[PDB]
A = this chain, B = another copy of it.
Amino acid sequence: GSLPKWNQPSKEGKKITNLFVNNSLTHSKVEFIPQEGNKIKWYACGPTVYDAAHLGHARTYVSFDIIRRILVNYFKYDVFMVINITDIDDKIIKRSVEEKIGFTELARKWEYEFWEDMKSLNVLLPTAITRVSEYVGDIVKYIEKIIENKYAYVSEEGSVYFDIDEFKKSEKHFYARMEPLSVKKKKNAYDFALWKSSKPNEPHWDSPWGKGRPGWHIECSTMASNILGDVLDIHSGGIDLRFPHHDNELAQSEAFFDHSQWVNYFLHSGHLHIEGLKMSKSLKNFITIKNMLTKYTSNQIRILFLLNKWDNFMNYSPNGESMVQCIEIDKSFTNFFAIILMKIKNFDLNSCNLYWSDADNKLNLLFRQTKNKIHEHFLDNFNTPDALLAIQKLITEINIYMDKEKIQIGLLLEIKHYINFIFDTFGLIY
């Protein structure tokens, strides 16, 4: 009644880690519970491929890459991830006439460069990549089912619009679950297009209602539903997408399956700001990922994001100001591996003593303690800023121990392997 309800998955038969995540469906941190076993079905909104990707895009896809690496590499969940490519869009159509190359060729160019930028940043590719151009037929079938369930109507011009009022009336459906307060051819202004009648000279596709294009949001419901099904464990995106885009996805999918909860956990990354405003192509304040990579390394850019909680906004000071700290941390990690590898290489079993000393025991106690601190940090909504700090403090103490104390060779190797494990989870390469 007047407020959306959320149903936590049952814990029986599920992998229970006591992980808590910031869920935009509850606007709170709640325990994460798989729908089935240790499996996570995850859909993340992808880019609109008409121009270069910038540092703001890097923040979202790197941040959810880190979260994915924590879920899989650290907690041993089984993640099945899908990311779409929006290769049909008003921006793509307009840009293609300006550039006087085919719309498919333009979209394929900037999709190719998007994945190259992701690879440059050590971002894992998803399990599946779904292009709108390859799913238009499935989109048409999806819209047909929504109409059959009486949740969409066809205008005379040949467009199809979602019927918000009819959808709300159903007791099992609520519109705008995550931003309830954000709410001629249409019944009501809040109705949004599932199928757009095509304007002349635009690319178009056949449908039962006439030549047209998919609407802004129908592509994501169709693709996620086809591959992942009627319940998603995780759906992700930047916070700007929460409404209208993500709330409208929930309405479309609920209308298709005629059920109440298409997504269990909705995660939204915070925006990267530059001089107080979201980094955006519109504001012309953006730094491309390629330009960023001519000045800084993949590790340094990922450290920038590791230092900022994924779901909070962050301020990026350009001209290297924000990257001063990132460069210092990367340099100390590189030097740590140089030193510890050298101490291991030069260790002589024949002459050195291996008595387990008080100094050895103290370092070990700090080592196991650091493992538990980092475990709590990851459970605490993927708190990488504090996990990174824990590693820094441990490295500070290993450096002291290596300089003076007689070194336990096995202890140093064990610690090196643990730090490698955490850095693999972070996406750092040393």
Contact = CB atoms under 8 A, between A and B. Distances in A.
This protein's copies in its complex: 2
A78 interface: yes
Interface string A353-377: 1111000110010001001100000
A127 B355 contact: no
Contacts of A227: 356, 361
Interface string A124-148: 1111111100110000000000000
A111 interface: yes
B125 A410 contact: yes
B80 A37 contact: no
A108 B349 contact: yes
Given A349-B108, A349-B115, A368-B39, A411 B356 contact: no
A20 interface: no
A129 B76 contact: no
Interface residues of A, number: 45
A122 to B, nearest CB: 12
B350 A129 contact: no
Interface in A215-265: 226-227
A410 B127 contact: yes
Contact of A411 (B127, B350, B414): B127
A86 interface: no
A112 interface: yes
Top 3 A-B residue pairs of the complex, sorted by shortest distance between their CB atoms: A125-B410, A129-B354, A112-B350
18 contacts: A78-B371, A80-B364, A80-B368, A108-B350, A111-B349, A111-B350, A124-B414, A125-B410, A127-B410, A127-B414, A128-B408, A128-B410, A129-B349, A129-B354, A129-B409, A130-B354, A134-B354, A135-B355
Given A78-B368, A131-B355, 17 more contacts: A37-B372, A111-B349, A111-B350, A115-B349, A124-B413, A124-B414, A124-B417, A125-B410, A125-B413, A127-B408, A128-B360, A129-B349, A129-B354, A129-B410, A134-B355, A135-B355, A227-B356
